[PDB]
Amino acid sequence: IPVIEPLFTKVTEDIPGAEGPVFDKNGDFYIVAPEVEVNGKPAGEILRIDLKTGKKTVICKPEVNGYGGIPAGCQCDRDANQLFVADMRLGLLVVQTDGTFEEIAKKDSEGRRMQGCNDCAFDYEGNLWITAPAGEVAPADYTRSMQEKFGSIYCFTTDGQMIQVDTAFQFPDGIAVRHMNDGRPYQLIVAETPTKKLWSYDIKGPAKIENKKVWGHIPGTHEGGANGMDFDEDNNLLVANWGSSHIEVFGPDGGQPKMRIRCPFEKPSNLHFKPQTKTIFVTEHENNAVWKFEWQRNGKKQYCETLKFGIF
Ligand SMILES: [Ca+2]
Ligand SMILES: [Ca+2]
């Protein structure tokens, strides 16, 4: 397997549990610090980063009824410049650029308690697919499915339904939607960290997935595995392999990686392309910092970059 060593440039530092890098509709850059704590209690933050100075601005420090959040993953909406944030303690949140937020669901469509979420990914239809490796959201005691298979997957539909689409995962983490060349969603890829596996489903429609299949294998025997992920414009899936010092590059069909990217750190946690560029911003937990490097090509256009009222 060929391996490349591009130059990684420091972007910002000192972000506890650096994670969920994302760009909004204005091109502003954000990341989350899920592990910031106050008196040992969860006090996660959502930060805006000045790409030119690297200076940090905490725009939101979520909390519901006294319970602080553990914001871990993000996706920028299209129909409004707002961020959907997966939170390990509060579930799904919608965060405005002004820092105000709202908790989306305390229970799912079947009336069962919502679970803590980790990452999410919009399909071009506007449906948000979410991973939920944690147990019930606050005020329930904090737990994670690293050892027991109770992690779940959700789909938040355009009509506002929070539907659990599957469960029994051992820490579902990164997630991504593979689209047909004409833009139709048809494959959901889910990372299950400890098992060193990438799972896929055939997307049949909103909150409808079938045929769970082992899609790809993550290299290494180290503690950790697939964390965050994203597709480039050719539909190659780049996955942060936490603990391996590499970002794995899978081809459209999966299987084994067809290439690897060596990082100047051991724990890449998540990544995200800057719109209209080949630049990938990476969050990592060895130094709790954010970096950037140039990929061989541009990233797959995110849902927020598409036009709802376009002709084509
Ligand atoms: Ca993650
Ligand atoms: Ca990303």
Side-chain angles (χ1 to χ4, degrees), residues 19 27 50 150 165 178-179 181 201 261 263 271:
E19 172 73 275
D50 181 303
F150 60 80
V165 291
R178 182 190 186 192
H179 297 89
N181 297 299
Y201 294 82
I261 302 165
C263 301
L271 50 73

Short mmCIF file of all heavy atoms in Angstrom, two decimals, residues 19 27 50 150 165 178-179 181 201 261 263 271:
data_model
loop_
_atom_site.label_atom_id
_atom_site.label_comp_id
_atom_site.label_asym_id
_atom_site.label_seq_id
_atom_site.Cartn_x
_atom_site.Cartn_y
_atom_site.Cartn_z
N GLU A 19 -12.04 18.27 17.63
CA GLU A 19 -12.88 17.41 16.83
C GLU A 19 -13.88 18.20 15.97
O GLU A 19 -13.91 19.44 16.01
CB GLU A 19 -13.59 16.48 17.82
CG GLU A 19 -14.67 15.59 17.32
CD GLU A 19 -14.19 14.44 16.48
OE1 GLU A 19 -14.00 14.64 15.27
OE2 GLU A 19 -14.01 13.34 17.04
N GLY A 27 -17.73 30.35 4.65
CA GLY A 27 -16.35 29.93 4.56
C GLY A 27 -15.65 30.03 5.90
O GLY A 27 -14.43 29.87 5.98
N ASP A 50 -9.98 31.72 13.48
CA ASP A 50 -9.52 32.69 12.50
C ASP A 50 -8.38 32.00 11.75
O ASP A 50 -7.29 31.83 12.29
CB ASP A 50 -8.99 33.96 13.18
CG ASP A 50 -8.54 35.01 12.17
OD1 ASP A 50 -7.66 34.71 11.34
OD2 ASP A 50 -9.05 36.15 12.21
N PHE A 150 -24.29 -1.37 22.08
CA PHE A 150 -25.55 -0.65 22.23
C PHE A 150 -25.53 0.67 21.47
O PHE A 150 -26.46 1.48 21.56
CB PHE A 150 -25.89 -0.44 23.72
CG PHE A 150 -24.87 0.35 24.50
CD1 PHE A 150 -24.84 1.74 24.44
CD2 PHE A 150 -23.98 -0.30 25.35
CE1 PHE A 150 -23.93 2.47 25.21
CE2 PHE A 150 -23.06 0.42 26.12
CZ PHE A 150 -23.04 1.81 26.05
N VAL A 165 -32.32 4.10 12.85
CA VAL A 165 -32.37 3.18 11.72
C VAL A 165 -31.68 1.83 11.94
O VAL A 165 -31.87 0.90 11.16
CB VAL A 165 -31.83 3.86 10.44
CG1 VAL A 165 -32.81 4.93 10.01
CG2 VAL A 165 -30.46 4.48 10.70
N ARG A 178 -22.42 8.06 0.45
CA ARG A 178 -21.88 7.93 -0.90
C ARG A 178 -23.04 8.21 -1.85
O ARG A 178 -24.12 7.63 -1.71
CB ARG A 178 -21.34 6.52 -1.17
CG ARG A 178 -20.73 6.38 -2.55
CD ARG A 178 -20.41 4.94 -2.91
NE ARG A 178 -19.70 4.86 -4.18
CZ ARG A 178 -19.49 3.73 -4.86
NH1 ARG A 178 -19.94 2.57 -4.38
NH2 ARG A 178 -18.85 3.76 -6.01
N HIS A 179 -22.82 9.10 -2.82
CA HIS A 179 -23.86 9.44 -3.77
C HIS A 179 -23.54 8.94 -5.17
O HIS A 179 -22.39 8.70 -5.52
CB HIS A 179 -24.06 10.96 -3.84
CG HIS A 179 -24.54 11.57 -2.56
ND1 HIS A 179 -23.69 12.02 -1.58
CD2 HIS A 179 -25.80 11.82 -2.11
CE1 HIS A 179 -24.39 12.53 -0.58
NE2 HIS A 179 -25.67 12.42 -0.88
N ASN A 181 -23.31 9.49 -9.23
CA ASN A 181 -22.75 10.65 -9.92
C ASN A 181 -23.80 11.70 -10.25
O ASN A 181 -23.47 12.86 -10.48
CB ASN A 181 -22.04 10.20 -11.20
CG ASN A 181 -20.85 9.30 -10.93
OD1 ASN A 181 -19.90 9.71 -10.27
ND2 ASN A 181 -20.92 8.07 -11.42
N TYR A 201 -24.47 0.36 4.07
CA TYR A 201 -25.86 -0.03 3.88
C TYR A 201 -26.29 0.55 2.54
O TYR A 201 -25.70 1.52 2.07
CB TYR A 201 -26.79 0.59 4.92
CG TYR A 201 -26.60 0.14 6.34
CD1 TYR A 201 -25.61 0.71 7.15
CD2 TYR A 201 -27.46 -0.80 6.91
CE1 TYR A 201 -25.49 0.35 8.48
CE2 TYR A 201 -27.34 -1.16 8.25
CZ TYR A 201 -26.35 -0.58 9.02
OH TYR A 201 -26.24 -0.94 10.35
N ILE A 261 -1.99 8.04 4.34
CA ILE A 261 -1.38 9.35 4.50
C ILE A 261 -0.77 9.38 5.90
O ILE A 261 -1.48 9.26 6.89
CB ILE A 261 -2.43 10.47 4.37
CG1 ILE A 261 -3.11 10.38 3.01
CG2 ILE A 261 -1.76 11.84 4.56
CD1 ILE A 261 -4.39 11.19 2.89
N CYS A 263 0.65 10.99 9.10
CA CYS A 263 0.47 12.25 9.82
C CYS A 263 1.61 12.46 10.81
O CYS A 263 2.16 11.49 11.33
CB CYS A 263 -0.84 12.24 10.62
SG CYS A 263 -2.37 11.99 9.68
N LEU A 271 -11.51 15.08 10.00
CA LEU A 271 -10.97 15.90 8.91
C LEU A 271 -12.11 16.55 8.16
O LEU A 271 -13.26 16.19 8.36
CB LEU A 271 -10.12 15.04 7.97
CG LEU A 271 -10.72 13.72 7.44
CD1 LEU A 271 -11.77 14.01 6.39
CD2 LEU A 271 -9.61 12.89 6.82
#
